[PDB]
Design an enzyme around this catalytic site. Structure first.
Site, PDB file in Angstrom:
ATOM      1  N   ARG A 143       0.813  -1.207   0.000  1.00  0.00           N
ATOM      2  CA  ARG A 143       0.000   0.000   0.000  1.00  0.00           C
ATOM      3  C   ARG A 143       0.852   1.265   0.000  1.00  0.00           C
ATOM      4  NH1 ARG A 143      -3.908   2.879   4.352  1.00  0.00           N
ATOM      5  NH2 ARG A 143      -5.418   3.764   2.861  1.00  0.00           N
ATOM      6  N   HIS A 159      -6.395  -5.825  -2.338  1.00  0.00           N
ATOM      7  CA  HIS A 159      -7.244  -6.035  -1.178  1.00  0.00           C
ATOM      8  C   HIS A 159      -7.507  -7.517  -0.944  1.00  0.00           C
ATOM      9  CE1 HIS A 159      -8.870  -1.628  -1.530  1.00  0.00           C
ATOM     10  NE2 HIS A 159      -7.636  -1.693  -1.063  1.00  0.00           N
ATOM     11  N   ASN A 180      -3.603   8.735   4.219  1.00  0.00           N
ATOM     12  CA  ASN A 180      -2.455   8.180   4.931  1.00  0.00           C
ATOM     13  C   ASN A 180      -2.520   8.276   6.445  1.00  0.00           C
ATOM     14  OD1 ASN A 180      -0.837   7.309   2.706  1.00  0.00           O
ATOM     15  ND2 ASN A 180      -0.314   9.450   2.305  1.00  0.00           N
ATOM     16  N   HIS A 234       0.454   4.314  -2.621  1.00  0.00           N
ATOM     17  CA  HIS A 234       0.283   5.714  -2.258  1.00  0.00           C
ATOM     18  C   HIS A 234       1.473   6.581  -2.647  1.00  0.00           C
ATOM     19  CE1 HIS A 234      -3.286   5.443   0.794  1.00  0.00           C
ATOM     20  NE2 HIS A 234      -3.572   4.943  -0.395  1.00  0.00           N
ATOM     21  N   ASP A 235       2.619   5.962  -2.906  1.00  0.00           N
ATOM     22  CA  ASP A 235       3.762   6.750  -3.337  1.00  0.00           C
ATOM     23  C   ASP A 235       3.521   7.092  -4.802  1.00  0.00           C
ATOM     24  OD1 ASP A 235       6.160   7.966  -3.876  1.00  0.00           O
ATOM     25  OD2 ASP A 235       7.311   6.103  -4.033  1.00  0.00           O
TER      26      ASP A 235
HETATM   27  C1  HEM Z   1      -9.037   1.501  -6.068  1.00  0.00           C
HETATM   28  C2  HEM Z   1      -9.016   2.393  -4.938  1.00  0.00           C
HETATM   29  C3  HEM Z   1      -8.591   2.073  -3.651  1.00  0.00           C
HETATM   30  C4  HEM Z   1      -9.181   2.521  -2.512  1.00  0.00           C
HETATM   31  C5  HEM Z   1     -10.382   3.455  -2.410  1.00  0.00           C
HETATM   32  C6  HEM Z   1      -8.463   1.959  -1.402  1.00  0.00           C
HETATM   33  C7  HEM Z   1      -8.789   2.155  -0.064  1.00  0.00           C
HETATM   34  C8  HEM Z   1      -8.164   1.577   1.032  1.00  0.00           C
HETATM   35  C9  HEM Z   1      -8.612   1.717   2.394  1.00  0.00           C
HETATM   36  C10 HEM Z   1      -9.855   2.452   2.896  1.00  0.00           C
HETATM   37  C11 HEM Z   1      -7.778   0.977   3.158  1.00  0.00           C
HETATM   38  C12 HEM Z   1      -7.925   0.792   4.663  1.00  0.00           C
HETATM   39  C13 HEM Z   1      -6.934   1.656   5.424  1.00  0.00           C
HETATM   40  C14 HEM Z   1      -7.131   1.601   6.929  1.00  0.00           C
HETATM   41  O1  HEM Z   1      -8.200   1.146   7.382  1.00  0.00           O
HETATM   42  O2  HEM Z   1      -6.213   2.025   7.660  1.00  0.00           O
HETATM   43  C15 HEM Z   1      -6.807   0.377   2.257  1.00  0.00           C
HETATM   44  C16 HEM Z   1      -5.851  -0.571   2.626  1.00  0.00           C
HETATM   45  C17 HEM Z   1      -5.044  -1.305   1.754  1.00  0.00           C
HETATM   46  N1  HEM Z   1      -5.007  -1.099   0.384  1.00  0.00           N
HETATM   47 FE1  HEM Z   1      -6.322  -0.095  -0.741  1.00  0.00          FE
HETATM   48  N2  HEM Z   1      -7.437   1.154  -1.841  1.00  0.00           N
HETATM   49  C18 HEM Z   1      -7.461   1.263  -3.222  1.00  0.00           C
HETATM   50  C19 HEM Z   1      -6.501   0.670  -4.059  1.00  0.00           C
HETATM   51  C20 HEM Z   1      -5.409  -0.099  -3.675  1.00  0.00           C
HETATM   52  C21 HEM Z   1      -4.314  -0.503  -4.550  1.00  0.00           C
HETATM   53  C22 HEM Z   1      -4.186  -0.085  -6.016  1.00  0.00           C
HETATM   54  C23 HEM Z   1      -3.439  -1.212  -3.771  1.00  0.00           C
HETATM   55  C24 HEM Z   1      -2.201  -1.784  -4.105  1.00  0.00           C
HETATM   56  C25 HEM Z   1      -1.881  -2.429  -5.355  1.00  0.00           C
HETATM   57  C26 HEM Z   1      -4.006  -1.214  -2.437  1.00  0.00           C
HETATM   58  C27 HEM Z   1      -3.513  -1.934  -1.360  1.00  0.00           C
HETATM   59  C28 HEM Z   1      -4.003  -1.925  -0.064  1.00  0.00           C
HETATM   60  C29 HEM Z   1      -3.535  -2.781   0.993  1.00  0.00           C
HETATM   61  C30 HEM Z   1      -2.603  -3.974   0.788  1.00  0.00           C
HETATM   62  C31 HEM Z   1      -4.159  -2.382   2.136  1.00  0.00           C
HETATM   63  C32 HEM Z   1      -3.963  -2.951   3.541  1.00  0.00           C
HETATM   64  C33 HEM Z   1      -2.850  -2.179   4.229  1.00  0.00           C
HETATM   65  C34 HEM Z   1      -2.602  -2.633   5.653  1.00  0.00           C
HETATM   66  O3  HEM Z   1      -3.287  -3.567   6.119  1.00  0.00           O
HETATM   67  O4  HEM Z   1      -1.711  -2.047   6.305  1.00  0.00           O
HETATM   68  N3  HEM Z   1      -5.177  -0.485  -2.370  1.00  0.00           N
HETATM   69  N4  HEM Z   1      -7.087   0.715   0.945  1.00  0.00           N
HETATM   70 CA    CA Z   2       5.108   9.885  -4.687  1.00  0.00          CA
END
Ligand code: HEM
Ligand code: CA
Ligand code: CA
Length: 306
Positions: free
Chosen positions: A38, A170, A70, A42-43
């Site tokens: 993630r 996800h 973030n 975000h980078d």
């Molecule tokens: C398509 C739009 C996307 C949205 C709206 C989104 C949104 C989010 C949200 C709401 C969280 C939860 C953060 C928290 O509760 O602290 C999250 C976590 C995460 N996202 Fe997404 N995300 C998106 C795309 C992606 C992409 C493109 C990747 C990577 C290829 C990614 C990888 C992750 C991972 C692995 C986590 C878990 C991080 C952790 O458990 O520390 N996300 N994301």
């Molecule tokens: Ca960047």
């Protein structure tokens, strides 16, 4: 142009050092692989993959760590510091933080059971951080499909395959109750739960995230295999079990004519998903990189060299 062999002469063991760091951290923090992937995402969505997200506050610019996407969410920064220090020891002033984070993301995916591939390298580090840009560019869980598509296109990823495949991130990781409360109790001011959320799963989620409960409580993105990088994420979508709004919209949105076939294809074949994920990951990793003599090879990922 970026190339996978960029450090084959200057730092041949960089990938191994990165992998070892993650393997060690996973023993105490099973969530780190997800967190690292993630961070790379975000980078890349903010001025490209230039390690801008790793920079801490300065009196001239604010850190992206305080962006809505973030703050109290992004994690793993100390781990990146650890691998950076190890790489700096192995190969002084050679590997950029931007490249380090890219390798870390790939190794994280592989360690979690995902595909294995050599990421293009040669990126350099930013000379500043972009908080406003992060607030504008990072997608949010409440985005509609058109908004998700807009967000990806805004940074350079035009393809629906980019969006559907990368959303596969996800397949593991955690999500705070805060981001699904609307889906569970009052979606779009309708006073009812999101109809695209499976009603059986709705009950389970309501139990994990009760009204007026701990909004910071964490829930697994993938109810099938919470920590394994696989295609189960898409199988969930087909059953209306995507956790956040942005997940389920890939399959249920009125604008999903182009994304539904991709979701099905990825749910039907691990190979199809893995191939698409690597393809999309490298495309995201190619977003406006600083190369050649542009930017620096940051020594401390938290601060610009002086
Ligand atoms: C398509 C739009 C996307 C949205 C709206 C989104 C949104 C989010 C949200 C709401 C969280 C939860 C953060 C928290 O509760 O602290 C999250 C976590 C995460 N996202 Fe997404 N995300 C998106 C795309 C992606 C992409 C493109 C990747 C990577 C290829 C990614 C990888 C992750 C991972 C692995 C986590 C878990 C991080 C952790 O458990 O520390 N996300 N994301
Ligand atoms: Ca960047
Ligand atoms: Ca999984």
């Amino acid at each position: 142009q970026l190339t996978p062999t960029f450090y084959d002469n200057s730092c041949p063991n960089v990938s191994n050092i990165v992998r070892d760091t993650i393997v060690n951290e996973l023993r105490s923090d099973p969530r780190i692989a997800a967190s690292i992937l993630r961070l790379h995402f975000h980078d890349c969505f903010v001025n490209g993959c230039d390690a801008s997200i790793l920079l801490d506050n300065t009196t001239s610019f604010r850190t992206e760590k305080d962006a809505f996407g973030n703050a109290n969410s992004a994690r793993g920064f100390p781990v990146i510091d650890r691998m950076k220090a190890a790489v700096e020891s192995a190969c002084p002033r050679t590997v950029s933080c931007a490249d380090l984070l890219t390798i870390a993301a790939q190794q994280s995916v592989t360690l979690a059971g995902g595909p294995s591939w050599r990421v293009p390298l040669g990126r350099r580090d930013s000379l500043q951080a972009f908080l406003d840009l992060a607030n504008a560019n990072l997608p949010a869980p409440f985005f509609t499909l058109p908004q998700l598509k807009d967000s990806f296109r805004n940074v350079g990823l035009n393809r629906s395959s980019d969006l559907v495949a990368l959303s596969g991130g996800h397949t593991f990781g955690k999500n705070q109750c805060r981001f699904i409360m609307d889906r569970l109790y009052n979606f779009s001011n309708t006073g009812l739960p999101d109809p695209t959320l499976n009603t059986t799963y709705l009950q389970t989620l309501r139990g994990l995230c009760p009204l007026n409960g701990n909004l910071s409580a964490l829930v697994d993105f993938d109810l099938r295999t919470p920590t394994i990088f696989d295609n189960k994420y898409y199988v969930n979508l087909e059953e209306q079990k995507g956790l956040i709004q942005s997940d389920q919209e890939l399959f249920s949105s009125p604008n999903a004519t182009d994304t539904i076939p991709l979701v099905r294809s990825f749910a039907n074949s691990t190979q199809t998903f893995f191939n698409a994920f690597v393809e999309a990951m490298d495309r995201m990793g190619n977003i406006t990189p600083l190369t050649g003599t542009q930017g620096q090879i940051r020594l401390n990922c938290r601060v610009v060299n002086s």
